[PDB]
Amino acid sequence: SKEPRELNREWLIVLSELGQGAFGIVYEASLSEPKAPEIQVAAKSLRKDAMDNEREELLEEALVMAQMEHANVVGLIGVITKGRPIYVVLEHMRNGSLKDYVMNKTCTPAQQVTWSRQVASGMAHIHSLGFIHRDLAARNVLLSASLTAKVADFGLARESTDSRGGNVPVRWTAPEALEDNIFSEKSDVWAFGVLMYEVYTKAAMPYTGWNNQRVWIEVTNGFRLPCPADCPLPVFKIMSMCWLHDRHERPSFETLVKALAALETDSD
């Protein structure tokens, strides 16, 4: 329904690396549209090792992102497709990943619950447009200058109406998606539960001390992570519902937003 707006290549100045991976490379940049103020942006491009199926995946990523217009989803500013290299220009998120922040900064209980509700709000919007993310984790949520949390990285997102390989993030994946390859709105919900666990701990990996095969066997047999010492009991209740074995009993993101919003203005 929506479409990426094309931007003149000469408006963009690429400045410095924000993050590199197998996916490609994200740069910090600036966009100087004539008669408008200069703004910081992020520019995502392809590995120097090109392949035309990778150009198409990047353009598909942009089209998915162009459908989103929400305060808790990283915004699409436009694309540069005439010429080479190709750039997808996105909103710049000054404060980096949610993961790095909670690991390295002091955060209050009211911040922890608001960030949780903000991510649920962004995922609710994604689902309400007919998509599933399939890759949610705290390293994939970014923080703006106002410390507003926003869902990023749509590399693996797919229309709901319809995996990677040895890179499967086992610690964030629901049992049914590991065993039967069934990805759905309710496996996104399971992953959000694990994200909440990350928000309330300061370790790098959930299930610390277990490898990936140990995690899978333990979780399919009914193990669940216990309540972090610094997590309020009403919050852990919500976290726990995201991990019910039967996916149909897990709440929707619309329900999660509401439950979290009630605690967000709770004094206790």
Numbering used by the authors: 1532 to 1693, 1699 to 1804
Provide text from the study.
Receptor tyrosine kinases are crucial signaling molecules in animal cells, regulating inter-cellular responses to extracellar signals via numerous different pathways dependent on the organism involved. These receptors consist of an extracellular ligand-binding domain, a single transmembrane helix, and a cytoplasmic tyrosine kinase domain. The choanoflagellate M. brevicollis contains 128 protein kinases, including 88 receptor tyrosine kinases. The kinase described in this study is from the M. brevicollis receptor tyrosine kinase C (RTKC) family.
We determined the crystal structure at 1.95 Å resolution of the kinase domain of the M. brevicollis receptor tyrosine kinase C8 (RTKC8, a member of the choanoflagellate receptor tyrosine kinase C family) bound to the kinase inhibitor staurospaurine. The kinase is crystallized in “DFGin” conformation where the DFG-Asp is pointed towards the active site and the DFG-Phe interacts with the αC-helix. The tyrosine residues which would be expected to be phosphorylated in the activation loop (Tyr 1697 and Tyr 1698) were in the disordered activation loop region. There are three hydrogen bonds, with Glu 1622, Met 1624 and Arg 1670 and five hydrophobic interactions, with Leu 1549, Val 1557 and Ala 1573 from N-lobe, and Gly 1627 and Leu 1673 from C-lobe. Another molecule of staurosporine was found bound to the C-lobe of the kinase domain in a hydrophobic groove between the activation loop, the αEF helix and the αG helix. The purified RTKC8 kinase is catalytically active and can phosphorylate tyrosine residue containing peptides generated from its C-terminal tail sequence.
